[PDB]
Amino acid sequence: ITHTGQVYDEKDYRRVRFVDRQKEVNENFAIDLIAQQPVNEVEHRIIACDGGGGALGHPKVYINLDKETKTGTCGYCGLQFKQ
Amino acid sequence: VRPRSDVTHKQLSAFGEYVAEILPKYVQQVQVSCLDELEICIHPDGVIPTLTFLRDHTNAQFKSLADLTAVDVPTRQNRFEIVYNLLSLRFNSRIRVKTYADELTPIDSIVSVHIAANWYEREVWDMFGVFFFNHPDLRRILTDYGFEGHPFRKDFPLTGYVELRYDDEVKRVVAEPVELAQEFRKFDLNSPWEAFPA
Amino acid sequence: MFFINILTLLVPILIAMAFLTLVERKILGYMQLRKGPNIVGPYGILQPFADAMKLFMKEPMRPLTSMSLFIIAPTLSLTLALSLWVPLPMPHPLINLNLGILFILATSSLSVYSILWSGWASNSKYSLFGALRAVAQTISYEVTMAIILLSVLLMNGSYSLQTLITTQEHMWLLLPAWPMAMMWFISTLAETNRAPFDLTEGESELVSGFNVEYAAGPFALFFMAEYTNIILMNALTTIIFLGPLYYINLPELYSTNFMMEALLLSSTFLWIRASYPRFRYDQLMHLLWKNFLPLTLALCMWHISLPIFTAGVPPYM
């Protein structure tokens, strides 16, 4: 159901709660949204990742897209960068 | 950097000796902090005498009692540190006189010297448990009527031991031992690295 | 017919009584920079009917109080107020009580029982104090209230309210006797426990002693009573001191004029309430046993001598 698949179960004593009232779950789960994000190709060995917008992003980090074997992923945006 | 005026540091220091000489008997330590404040420390027996001299001395009139409080250092044999902060509208100055009292060794009351203390002394008894002899009417002020335990003592649990809810069966509010639904998360915050004292 | 003439003279007043609360909760509002109640109904016209229905539906709490007296006081209150409107001399008054003013004075006095008994019956400390305070102020203001009327009558010639329409065919009795009008107006403010003199239900000082325990239907009946009175006493000011024009050919003009003056003086005690803080209990009584009663006694003499030395004794018809 939800992000980490919370599933109050058919036998749980808590699934009682939703009776006559819906559960809060999310469409466009994020888990798949960045996976849906194209790999940002770059020329330089290392690249930055302000998160986009500077102050309105994440603390800037420099990712080493040095091995095509792996597309660097800024630990903050989950954006893969293709050397 | 704060705008320290050495002019003060000196004048207050000089008064600190003045008082120390005037009442050699009860003053144990006197120091003018770098924050430009004097904190005469007196033996508990000097509560009445030291205050009275400050309330009624031409060269040191300290008419109003700003506050009476009791820090509790559990390590210290004398647990409580009654602190009396006083003001002098005449000399535009202040001084703090602090004494030490243990749980069952009461301090004298100064309601005579300043009637402001009538309430604060009741506040110190209710929260910390120090007792004040010769107090007109010492009785809990801030805590509930049936409260058991002195709350601001460092050895008292924050949440306490009793909480109240309304029970239908008995149609009346009823204490029950505290049961909390998210305990106070006790974040440890002290850093293992000190700061080289200036 | 006479029955129809009882519906009119009652309902009409009750409907108007309801619209006074509304014109109180809006005139006080605009004076205090606020619209007042306009959201229920159009411009708040349905607002008085709305809380009436809430009040009657909510439980009539019977505290664990002398029931009979507790319930009677409200009844007396409303009974008296509606009754005092019977002999009013709007043209062709419902009932020409020859000694009408006396009747008005009498019923007005009986009202005190309600507040007194209510407090005693309520059995609450707040209520008790309210009653004691109320009875004292009420009766005292009655003593100057009565003397002020006796001065009037002696210049009217009779106790019948109908005579004043013939006394005031050339000039209002305010011009003469204005000094008492003011003293009738202030006494009318005390006897309706309105603001400047509202220590009966100060709310802030003591919390509504009169109806501390009264809620729902009992609250409403006194409630209704007070407001009807608020009008009646203002209306008595508009007959005794401000004499509306009257023409035998056209008797309506009087009613219309009576309307305008009654509404304005009814508006005035609304305006007084928002404008003034409340007098203390001691201060209130001092004003009447001390500031006024000596004024009211003396002028009584002046109004006894006036006719004689002016050979202006009035006809007794």
Add this chain to the structure above:
Amino acid sequence: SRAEYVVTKLDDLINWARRSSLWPMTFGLACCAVEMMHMAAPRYDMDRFGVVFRASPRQADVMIVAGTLTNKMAPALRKVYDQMPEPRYVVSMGSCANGGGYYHYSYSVVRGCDRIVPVDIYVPGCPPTAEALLYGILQLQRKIKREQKLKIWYRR
């Protein structure tokens, strides 16, 4: 003529009367009255909406528990609540009274007023904005509108 219809209409009238005039009660405990007093004040007139702030438990309906319900005041709240007229609704106002608020873990604060009085609308915010209280009072009005007391009588 079906009484069922006759009943619904009647109920509605009853609901309109109550919802229209909700004389709130004087209950400021922890500086949220300041906000409430703002509602009563001119920008956001409570009166227009019917609210009149009566000050006697007996003739007041809604009890806006604005503020922290300390342990010492707990019984009192219950008393005043019990002494209000029959149809009584409680509007908890403030994080200090919805739950415990900044003082939830304290030894002298009841963690919520809904542990001492049943609560109908919970208005959130440390100083819940006056507009928010007004929103909360308006939601009590929609709660009352939906209540169908006589139809349940009829169908019972």
Add this chain to the structure above:
Amino acid sequence: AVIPHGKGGRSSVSGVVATVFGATGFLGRYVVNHLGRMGSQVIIPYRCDVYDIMHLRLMGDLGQLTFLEWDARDKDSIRKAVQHSNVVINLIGREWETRNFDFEDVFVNIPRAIAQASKEAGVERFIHVSHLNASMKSSSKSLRSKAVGEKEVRSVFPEAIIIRPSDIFGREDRFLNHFANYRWFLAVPLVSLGFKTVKQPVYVADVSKGIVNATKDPDAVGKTFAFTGPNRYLLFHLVKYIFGMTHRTFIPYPLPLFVYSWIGKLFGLSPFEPWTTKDKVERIHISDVMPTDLPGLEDLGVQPTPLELKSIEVLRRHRTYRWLSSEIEETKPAKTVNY
């Protein structure tokens, strides 16, 4: 199941998810109280308006109580209520069979469908409640019907604990308040002058704890416990005693039950919750069965509580301005007639 963790008070878990259909009423107020105190998950089906159900909300921790909209003439509503409960307690009952629900429905018809579904659901235990001395051939249609049902409930949920309680007295009690409420009638009409009417009263709390305990106790299965009381009484002392604590005069007046059944009919006629009813009258003048062998309150752990002990609280509201300050021990407790 739900492993029981906690210290035992509110905000703790006991693992009893329990539908309790008649929570809205007198005893329910008590059944939900203990269940909530213990920390059990309580689903309270309701058809009364939300304003009335509010008193229930205050009892139990955040999330312990869940309220579901339910109609007796709809089987589906009972179905979803017991979906996730493991204990079902049935307290559905009335004294005035109403226009659209007659004694069979409130006692036998409905309480059957309920336990029936409960089984389909797989609830561990069902606790039906029927009146004590509900002989299948008793005088009151009610008692007859209640017995009829207990027969049926045993078919649907075999061994669903059944509890037959004796007259129940507690604030808002009928047994104790009703008599005190005969004050309007200057004299008190009592068949056989209030004698020939032995009855044993049981405090509402006593009955409850038992019921709750029944859910958490293994022995209860397939039992017909009958919560009775700590002392029996001829209706005479009871009536006077009541009037005694109420401090109101007593004039016990003999009136034929024949004519009186008619008085019950009169009130029964009234549309709004008849103050009294043909049946209630019969039930009143119906003596209570002997101890027999059925287990009791103390068997379920709750030692019965004598009537005189808490009577003061139930009858206090009926006193006057001064009588409101008298206490039970200066007062004289009435004699106990076991007969």
Add this chain to the structure above:
Amino acid sequence: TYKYVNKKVDMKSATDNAARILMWTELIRGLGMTLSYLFREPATINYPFEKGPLSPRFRGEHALRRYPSGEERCIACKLCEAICPAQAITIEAEPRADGSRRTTRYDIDMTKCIYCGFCQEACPVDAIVEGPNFEFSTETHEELLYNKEKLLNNGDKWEAEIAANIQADYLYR
């Protein structure tokens, strides 16, 4: 510099005094003031139709934002939990399969929350923000407790205005 607020018999003086005392003048003066306002435009607003103005920094109701791509901003550093004065925010986290760091459970107890706005301050990625909405009064206490899904949903609903508000005030911060 000090000032004396209330430091302070000719026939005319006496007579005028009597004029005031017996003609109640100072009382009539007060009535004039209230009559004056009766004529002023009252300041009230139709509450549902017109709303009292709140500028961008208004703290209002908590929301968790997401990156434009769709990846929730929070990376569970959990210092929003650390600086919460009321202990309101409860966060427990575990590495999502992606390998990234995300919060399994983020629960703001709004009844515990005193809307200080420090969480808005503390977040490095600025994932938790004080959203503009103040109207979230709820019938039941449980609704006020908010898990990650309600806050993320709150974030999605008000993201457009939250973005505008943060846009207006970020230079100041």
Add this chain to the structure above:
Amino acid sequence: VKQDMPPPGGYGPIDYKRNLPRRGLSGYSMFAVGIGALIFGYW
């Protein structure tokens, strides 16, 4: 980058003093109009 500051040249001046106006009809004049009213009324 701009900082909210007093406008150039400073703001204008505000009133910090009560401007309550001592306006009234003089007492003698006040009494005379009233006594004249009663005299006319009596006549």
Add this chain to the structure above:
Amino acid sequence: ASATRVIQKLRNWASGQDLQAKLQLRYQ
């Protein structure tokens, strides 16, 4: 505002000072 020039004059006469200069309605 929207005094109409007659309600304003009753306002000014009753108050005894010019409210027009210091209004209760804040404007741009």
Add this chain to the structure above:
Amino acid sequence: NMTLNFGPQHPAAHGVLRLVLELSGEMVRKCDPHIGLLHRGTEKLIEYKTYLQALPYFDRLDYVSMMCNEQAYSIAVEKLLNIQPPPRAQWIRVLFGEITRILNHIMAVTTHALDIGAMTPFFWMFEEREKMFEFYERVSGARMHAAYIRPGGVHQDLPLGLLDDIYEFSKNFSLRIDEVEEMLTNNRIWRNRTVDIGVVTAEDALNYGFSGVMLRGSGIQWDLRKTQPYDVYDQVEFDVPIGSRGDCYDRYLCRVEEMRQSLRIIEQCLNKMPPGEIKVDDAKVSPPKRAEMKTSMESLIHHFKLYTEGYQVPPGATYTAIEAPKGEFGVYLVSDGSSRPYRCKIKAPGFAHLAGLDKMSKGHMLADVVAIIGTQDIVFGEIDR
């Protein structure tokens, strides 16, 4: 001697005060105020919280005066660190310090009247209050309970445009104070219920620790803002409104006069507020700007440590008192080297004032007690703490 509990829920009694009273006739023989109906633990809770997360408690201590209270803790924490705020921040604190004084006096004067029975002054000035709140909101984000004045300066510079509006308002507010005077200052009736009620001698006022308008009303000249200047209240020029024949009416006049004098201080602050920064530049005490923490490593480390752990104030203890609108508000903040305080007794102008209720309301009627609770501006938050 009839005993009666004024009652927690009294329309007049501010907040909740159980004033057990023994009334001979209507006269009040004895006045034993009960307190703690709003004790909440503010002093113990602070020991378990870091300096910056205890700042929001101070706004709640006496919330009529939301910010002025925050300045007292600020000053206290700044002294212990021997850091002082930047010049612009100081003026701000005096700007919002004064705006807050007005807010308190509008509360005290108008709420006083509502209990007396005058209700129109409250609505007149609550509209002005409202307008002020909006300043708070557009500066802090919250109408009240801002958290704007932090231990090292204010949190964020004023919005671009606030000063102009704090002018329009100030330019007019005077007339609004003027209007109220008309109704009360000289009402033939306000005077009576207020004049010669609760007279407090000068020697007795100092003795019972009144320290506020209550002292100033008795003619003692003491404004901690002139005697011991804090922030830049030294660079402004204002006149303390001293009083004579101290009584409810005189002190009132004093509170209306400080409303007037605060407009004089606000004007100046708008006329002379300096260009500059609004928080100390020591990332050690003040949190780093968000552009900096998102581009510079030392700033992130300083942001992370400051928010998660804290200031780490040097060990010491200080009693710093300002002139909060009610009176002397002081924080005695004992501090170990730790980031969380050890003790923080809040001196509440109000614990002393209530105590005086007994020595003020003697041989007085029930209505007199209502007037005197008003002339002490008792906010039960500060007294109960």
